[PDB]
Amino acid sequence: LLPVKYCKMRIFSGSTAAAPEEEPFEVWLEQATEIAKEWPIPEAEKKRWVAESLRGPALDLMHIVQADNPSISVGECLEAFKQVFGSTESRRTSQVKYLRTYQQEGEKISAYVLRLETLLRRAVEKRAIPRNIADQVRLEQVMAGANLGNVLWCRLQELKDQGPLPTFLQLMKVIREEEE
Amino acid sequence: LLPVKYCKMRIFSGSTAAAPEEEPFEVWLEQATEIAKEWPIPEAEKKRWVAESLRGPALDLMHIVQADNPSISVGECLEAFKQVFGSTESRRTSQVKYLRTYQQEGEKISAYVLRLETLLRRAVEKRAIPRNIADQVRLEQVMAGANLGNVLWCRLQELKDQGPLPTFLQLMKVIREEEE
C-alpha cells in the first residue's frame, strides 16, 4: 500500500577471500547474538534466521553443528562459531600487531589514526595496554608508523611535550585541521 | 713486601671516538652514584673523586655545571650528566626494541634470555611494561623469541598455566637443563 523502509542483513562467510559486502566476524556475532537473545521468535525460526545470514564455509559449519545435535540451542551454536572463527590474540601478539601497523600508501592520516584506534581498543580489551598510557601510544605510534612530516610533525611533537595529551576525537580535530 | 690485585678506576668521556678503556655511560654512572651516596668523605672531596673519573667532553660538563652553581650537590651534577649523556629511549622505542629481540646467529638460549632481561629492566624502569606482569612478558617474549625446543615449551607453558610464574633465575635453571 506504501513503501516500507527495509534493512540489509549482515552476511558472513568465514573465507579469507571475503566478498565486498561480507562483514568481519565480530560484527556478525553481534547480529547473531541479537537473534539468539533478543528476538521474540521461536528457536526453530532463530536457527533459520541465523543460517540465512551465512554463506560458504561459515554455512558449512552451521550444517555440521546441527547434524551432530539437532536439539542444540542457538546459544551453543554461537559458542561453536566463537570457538572456530573468534580472534585468537594474546598480550605479545596484540602489542606486536598494534606497533607493527604502519600507514598504508593510500591512507590519509585521519583515516590511518581511526584504523589505529580500533587496534588500540583491541589491545586494551586483551589488557595488553593500560588505559592511562593509551594517549602516549597513540601519538607515538602515529609519529612512528605514519608517513607524516613538516609542520604536522611539529604540531604532534608539540602536543607530545604539551602535558595534557589528546583524546582520540581531539587528535582527529587537530589532524582534520591539518588535512585542510 | 708481597703483590696484591690492583683494581683500576672506570673512566667516562662522551667522545664519539671512545677509547677501548672508556665505559658506556651507565657503568660509569654506577661508580659515580657510589661515590655520591655510599662513600663517607665530604662533598667537596666527592666532587674531586667524581671529576678524576672523567676526560674530554664529559669533564667539560663538570666544569660548566660547577660554574653555574658552586653550591651544587653531586646528586644534581649526576642529574645533569643523566640529562646530557643518558639514553633517549621512549615508551614506543623501549617497547619495540624489547618485543623485536629474537635469539640470533646460534646464541646459547641462556645467553639470549640474559640479553633479553637487560632490555626488560630498561623497559620496567620506564614503566613501558607494567611491573606486575614483567614475568608474563618475559615468558611470552622467550617463548616467541627463542629457538626453545618442545620439552622446554611444555615446561614453561605448564608453569604459566599452573600459575607459578618464574623469576629470571628459575627460568634460567629450566633453560640450562634443556640447553645441555
How far, in Å, CA of A109 to CA of A131, rounded?
23
From the list B51, B52, B49, B56, the residue with the least C-alpha distance to B14 is B56
Output phi, psi for B12, to 5 deg.
-120, 150
Of A91, A133, A136, the CB nearest to B136: A91
Q: Give the cell for residue B17.
A: 671516538
Axis crossing angle, helix A134-145 with helix A91-99, rounded to the nearest 10: 50
Q: Is B136 on the interface with A (CB under 8 A)?
A: yes
Instruction: Give DSSP secondary structure letters for B23-80.
Output: PPHHHHHHHHHHHHHT--S-HHHHHHHHHTTB-THHHHHHHHHHHH-TT--HHHHHHH
Calculate the alpha carbon distances from A94 to A74, B25, B67 in Å. Answer: 30, 34, 50
Output DSSP code: residue B155.
H
3-state secondary structure of A12: strand
Of B99, B130, B141, the CB nearest to A99: B99
Q: Give the cell for residue B145.
A: 623469541
CA angle A89, A130, B171 (to 5 degrees): 65
Write the burial class of residue B164 (CB in 10 Å: 0-12 exposed, 13-18 middle, 19+ buried).
exposed
Q: Is A20 on the interface with B (CB under 8 A)?
A: no
E strands within A33-170? none
Are A39 and A46 contacting, i.e. CB atoms less than 8 angstroms apart?
A: yes
Residue A161 Rama label (left phi>0; alpha psi -120 to 50; beta): alpha
Output DSSP code: residue A22.
P
Contacts of B96 in chain A (CB under 8 A): 99, 144
How far, in Å, CA of A61 to CA of A47, rounded?
13
Give me the long-range contacts of A39-44 (CB less than 8 A, separation at least 24). A43/A73, A43/A74
Q: Is B96 on the interface with A (CB under 8 A)?
A: yes
How far, in Å, CA of A33 to CA of B49, rounded?
72
Are A19 and A13 contacting, i.e. CB atoms less than 8 angstroms apart?
A: yes
Technique of determination: cryo-EM
Q: Give the cell for residue B65.
A: 655545571
3-state secondary structure of A54: strand
Write the burial class of residue B115 (CB in 10 Å: 0-12 exposed, 13-18 middle, 19+ buried).
middle
Are B36 and B45 contacting, i.e. CB atoms less than 8 angstroms apart?
A: no
E strand or H helix at A91, and its extent? helix A91-99
Residues contacting residue A177 through CB under 8 Å, at least 6 positions apart: none
How far, in Å, CA of A24 to CA of A85, rounded?
10
The Cβ of residue A8 has, within 10 Å, a number of other Cβ atoms equal to 6
Of B90, B130, B141, the CB nearest to A92: B141
A96 with B92: Cβ contact below 8 A: no
Q: Which residues of B57-75 are buried (b: 16+ CB within 10 A; e: fewer)?
A: ebbebbeebeeeeeebebe
How far, in Å, CA of A102 to CA of A116, rounded?
9
Assign 3-state DSSP to chain B and report helix, strand, coil percentages, each to 5.
Answer: 60, 0, 35
Name the residue with cell 526453530: A44
CA angle A51, A54, A57 (to 5 degrees): 120
How long a stretch of residues is chain B? Answer: 180
Output DSSP code: residue B12.
B
Output phi, psi for A96, to 5 deg.
-65, -55
Both ends of chain A: CA-CA distance in Å?
Answer: 48
Output phi, psi for A54, to 5 deg.
-95, 150
How long a stretch of residues is chain A? Answer: 180
Output DSSP code: residue A132.
G
From the list B25, B8, B12, the residue with the least C-alpha distance to B53 is B12
A130 with B130: Cβ contact below 8 A: yes
